[PDB]
Amino acid sequence: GIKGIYKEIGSGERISLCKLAIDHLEQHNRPLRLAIDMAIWQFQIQAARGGSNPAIRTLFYRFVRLLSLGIHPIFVFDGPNKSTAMAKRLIRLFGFTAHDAPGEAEAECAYLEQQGIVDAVLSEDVDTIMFGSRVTLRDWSSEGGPPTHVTLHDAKKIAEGPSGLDREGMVLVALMSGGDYLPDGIPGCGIKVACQAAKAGFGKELCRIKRAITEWKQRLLHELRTNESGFFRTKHKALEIPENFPNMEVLRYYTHPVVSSPATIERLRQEFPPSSTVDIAGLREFTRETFDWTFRPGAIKLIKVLAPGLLVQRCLDRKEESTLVKGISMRREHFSTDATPELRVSFIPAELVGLDPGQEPEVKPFDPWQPDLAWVPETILKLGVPVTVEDWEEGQRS
DNA sequence: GAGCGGTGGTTGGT
DNA sequence: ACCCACCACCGCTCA
Ligand SMILES: [Mg+2]
Ligand SMILES: [Mg+2]
């Protein structure tokens, strides 16, 4: 669901997540806020093999990636109207927000975006659009290397594009063609004639009706058996429309989905994005117990992986400049960021992270005390370490 | 969830 | 009777 939708609305725009984050940071002078439907993990994550808890090792690595993009994420969990404990623990340890939707997470993500709690939705598909989403993203994946890209769909362009499908058009598409996950849906009716029904206006109409409907179903089911207005390709005098159609309860579930109370939205308005302050000692205990990153090798490995992320996180909360960045050596506009300008920065991983390997039993190599290098987006560096970027730019004009 | 070929059915037209 | 294009649906396969 909805099967074959992308043939209608398009497959969407592939775009560097770093480009979305940095464009938004430049346009709105604050980091991108993302609602992430926690259901997107189940498929991608079950492929990591080896070690201890690989499904949530890779969740760990995606959280470090979100640290370095400078994205403020709210992770949304499904509720009962229609391991998560480690995960909610790991969310907290990274200073991210966990939110339990009352019902479907997709409906709640979309609601958080139209209330302004978040700027975009990352979900598994475009169901979010029937639920009111405007900017919806899916398929955070390589473009087979690191996951750098998402597929962007825009409700404003879709609705005025070739399909013409808007929220009520789609919604009629799922009422007519969704016979396999919604009751009282027209057998033998698929995406093609549901979509030319939507285009003929029957979705705007049904949606603007008090849950009367009889002067619509008869009007529709006659336009189908005869095609008098030529609203479709062929006649359909054999589509048996069930008497309990349109199931308006199924309509209510899309038009008025079960979302958080008004008071909960106001709570989120004051509390998200909440304070980050990555729990360094908490992540050290977590990785020791869950990944078996034991003793000094496991402390040194946490440092290598976490250090570039804290650099970014600390640059967005922000003389004291030298404490995060020792130098800049180059610039690039690499295609993996859709040409976001990045600066090559030096830093001391163990100095930046705050843990000490020698307080752990010792059991070519990587020294957390020597300088490491990372590519960081130039506009994040102008915010956090501004006079270092001047001197490099003055050095460059020399 | 999403893509793909097979397939069995409907429509409209030989 | 039969062809044909279109389509919905299904099993399969990557998840
Ligand atoms: Mg969904
Ligand atoms: Mg869905």
Author numbering: 2 to 83, 99 to 159, 163 to 230, 235 to 341, 356 to 400, 431 to 465
Which lines from the publication concern this structure?
GEN1 is a member of the FEN/EXO family of structure-selective nucleases that cleave 1 nt 3′ to a variety of branchpoints. By contrast GEN1 cleaves DNA 1 nt 3′ to the point of strand exchange on two strands of four-way junctions, and the key distinction from the other members of the family is that it acts as a homodimer and thus makes two incisions into the junction.
The C-terminal end of the loop (I205 to G209) adopts the same conformation as that in the Cs+ structure (RMSD = 0.21 Å), so that the K+ ion is positioned similarly to Cs+, and the main chain O atoms of I205 and C208 together with S196 at the N-terminal end bind the K+ ion in the same manner. The N-terminal section of the loop between G196 and G204 takes a very different trajectory in the K+ structure. The effect of this is that the loop is less extended compared to the Cs+ structure, thus disrupting the interaction of D203 with the monovalent metal ion. Importantly, D199 is no longer within the active site in the K+ structure, and its carboxylate is 12 Å from the M2 Mg2+ ion. In Na+ and K+ ions the loop is less extended, so that the D199, Y200 is substantially retracted away from the active site.
